[PDB]
Amino acid sequence: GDTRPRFLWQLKFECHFFNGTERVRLLERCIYNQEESVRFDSDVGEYRAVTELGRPDAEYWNSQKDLLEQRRAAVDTYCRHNYGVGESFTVQRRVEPKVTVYPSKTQPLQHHNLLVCSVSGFYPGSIEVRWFRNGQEEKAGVVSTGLIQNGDWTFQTLVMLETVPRSGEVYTCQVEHPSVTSPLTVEWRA
Amino acid sequence: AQSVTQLGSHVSVSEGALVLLRCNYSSSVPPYLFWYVQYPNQGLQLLLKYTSAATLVKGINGFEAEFKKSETSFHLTKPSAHMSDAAEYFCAVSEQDDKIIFGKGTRLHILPNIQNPDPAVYQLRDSKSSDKSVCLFTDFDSQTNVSQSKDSDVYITDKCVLDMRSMDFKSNSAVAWSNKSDFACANAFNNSIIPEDTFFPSP
Amino acid sequence: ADVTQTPRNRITKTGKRIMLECSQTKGHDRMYWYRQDPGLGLRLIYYSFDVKDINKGEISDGYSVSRQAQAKFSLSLESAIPNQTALYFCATSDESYGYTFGSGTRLTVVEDLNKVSPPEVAVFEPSEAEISHTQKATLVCLATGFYPDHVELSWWVNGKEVHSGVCTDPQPLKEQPALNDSRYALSSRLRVSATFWQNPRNHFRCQVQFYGLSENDEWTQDRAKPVTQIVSAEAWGRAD
Amino acid sequence: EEHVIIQAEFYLNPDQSGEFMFDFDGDEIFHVDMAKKETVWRLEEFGRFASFEAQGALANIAVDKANLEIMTKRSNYTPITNVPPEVTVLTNSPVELREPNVLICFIDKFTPPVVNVTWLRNGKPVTTGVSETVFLPREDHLFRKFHYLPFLPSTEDVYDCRVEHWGLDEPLLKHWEFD
C-alpha cells in the first residue's frame, strides 16, 4: 500500500589486493538510484565524473589539493592497514570440508547408478574434487552442481558420477583443499 | 585516538634561535597528527596537519614538522623565534576515529635579546595620591629572575617582557607593592638575586 | 565566524544547572565540546555525529548535551561545582579532519556569590629617575581586591586601545594565599618614550573589564552589587 | 591470489534506513548496528581478533543522508526504478531425516533495499529461531539478502519463503520439501 517514490544513495570503498599487499587499488564510488555518478580510482589519482550529475562533485573535490593527497595515501593507511587487520581470519581462514558419498539409487550390481559426493562446510572456495574407480581417475560422466556460497563463510558443492557398479569395484571420492595436508578420500564399496 | 605526550609545560628559547617543540604519539593505526597554537587572549589555530601524504609537513610562518614513525615523533620546528611566537602549543592525534585527542600543551617563552641592560628599581607614585606607590624593577637581562616575597604583606609579580614598538625596544620588569609602613623600594626585592650594579635612585 | 558560542563569559554559583550554546553556519554533521585547563590540554566532554546522536568523551561526568538540530550543540553543567571553572570550546569538523573551534566560553563557578567583588584600579606614574636615566617612562596599573579571577585589563592612550609597550601579568596573584576564596590582584605596565609622557595633553587610561553578577542575581549586601562592569583609572602626561 | 575488501554504505528515503558494512570476497565481516552503536561480527570469532569503533559509521551515515538530499534535489526529485528480486530456497548442508539443518531464503538482484520475508511451514507462518542478514552488496549495485530458518527435516513438513517487494506485481512464493 506504500506508493511513495524512493531515493537511494550508495557508497562503496573497494580495496583490490594482488599478490597479497604487493599491488593495491582503491576505488571509491558514489551511486545515486543505482547509477554511479562520481568515482575516485587510485590508478588515476583524482575524482572523475561517471555521469553528468557527478561533474560538480568531481570538480569540487579535485580542487582541494590536500584532500586528493590524503585519498591517494589511503591505499596504505586504509587498504593495506585493514588487510593486515583481518588477514588472520579472512585470507587465512581454513575450514575443513565434510565429505560423504552414497549411491543415489539403491539397486543391484551391473545396473546404471549415480554416485554422489557431497562436500560441504569448507572455506576458502578453491577446491578440487575427483572421482576414482578402483584407483583410476574418471573424468567422464562426472557432473557437478558447481560451487555455491552459503553466505556464512562456508561453501558447498555436490559432485555426481554416473557409473555401472560391478562386483569388486571400490569407488573413491578424492578432494583437495587448502585446509588439508593431503587429499581427503571416502569410499563406497559395490 | 590513543595518546600524545608533550615534554615540558613551560619552555624557553632565545629570540632569534631555532624553535623545537617535542611531541611523541601512541597509536595502533596510521594517525592524523596536528599542531595547534593558542595566542594570548585568543582561541585555537591549526598550524599543521599530518595526513600520511608526506612526512615533512609545512605550515604557516615557517612552521614545519617531520613525521618519524620509527621514533613515533612529530616535533614542531620554526627556524627563528620571534617575540610574537610566545603562545601555548598543543600536539594532537586521531586514530582515524573522527575525534582529536590533545596533548597537555607547552607554553613557549621567548627570551628577548637585551643588548644594553640597565637594571634599576624605581618608585612610582599613584597619580591620585602623594602617599601611595609601587616599586618597579626593570631593564635587567635574562640572567636575573625574580623570587617571590617572604613577607606575606609584600606582593611581587613574575617578570613580564614588554615590546615598545615605538622604539623597537624590549625590556623585562617586575612590580612589588605593600601596604606596610616599613616598605621601601631599596628592600622590596631583597629576596631576589639582583645584579650587583642595579641602579637605586636617591628617593 | 562559522562557529558562535554564547555566552562568552559567565559566573555561576555552585549547585546550579548552567547551559552553554554553540551554533554553526557550515552544516557540519560532527560537533564537539572540549574544556581547556592549565596543564591538561583540551579534554573532550561530549561529541555528536548527527542530530540526536550523543557520545561521551573523556570527562563527561557532571555534563550533558543535546543535539536537537544540526546547527546547534548545547552543553549543560548538571550541577555546577568549582572545578568546572574552565575555558569551554565547541568545535565542528568537516569530512576530512578540518576542525573549526569556537572562540571559547570562560566559565567561573564560585561557591558563594557573596564573595564577588569588583577591582579597585590605580595608575602609578613614571618616576623622574627613570625618565632621566633611560629617556623612557613606565606607567603601572594595579587592579586589586577583586573576586573571582575573571577580568580583562587593557590600556587606552588618547582614547585608543594600545598593545605596544604593554605587559600584563598572565595570572593574578592571591592577596591572601591561605584562603580558598582570597581576592586577587593583577598588575600591568605600559612603557612610552619620555617625550610622549612629557606632553600634558596625552591621556593614559588603564581599563579593567570585570565579570561578576548579572541583573538576575540577588544581592543582599550594603555595598554596591558587584555586577559585570568596567573600572578604570587614568593619568595625564606631565611636563615637569 | 586476488582479494577484495569493500566498505559499503547506503541511505534510503523516505524510509530513513541506512546500513554500514564491510565485505571480504563476497562474505560479510561486520556491520554496524546504528541504534545500539555496536559492531556486529558475522562470526563470533572475528571480534576476538579485531575491533571497529561503531560510532564512526554514524558520522558517515550522517553525510550520506546529506548527500542523498543534495542528489535528490539535483535530479529534480527523480526516484529510483524498482528492480524486483529473484528468490532461491536451499540448505547450507545436505538434508537428512531428523538431523537439524537451516533453510536459506536467498533474495538477489533487487533494489531499493526494502523487502518483506515470511516463512511458511505447512502453509502457516513460523518465526521460531529465524534470523536474517543485512542488505549485502553486488557489483551491479543491486542487493542480496539471506534469511534463515532452523528446522529438523521430516517427510511431513512443507515450506515456503514468501518475498514481497515493490518491483514485484505479486508476492514471490518459493517452495521446499524433503526429496
Added chain:
Amino acid sequence: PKYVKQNTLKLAR
C-alpha cells in the same frame, strides 16, 4: 587491531 573506515565526503552544494 583496529579496522578504519574511509570518510564519506560531502557533495558540492
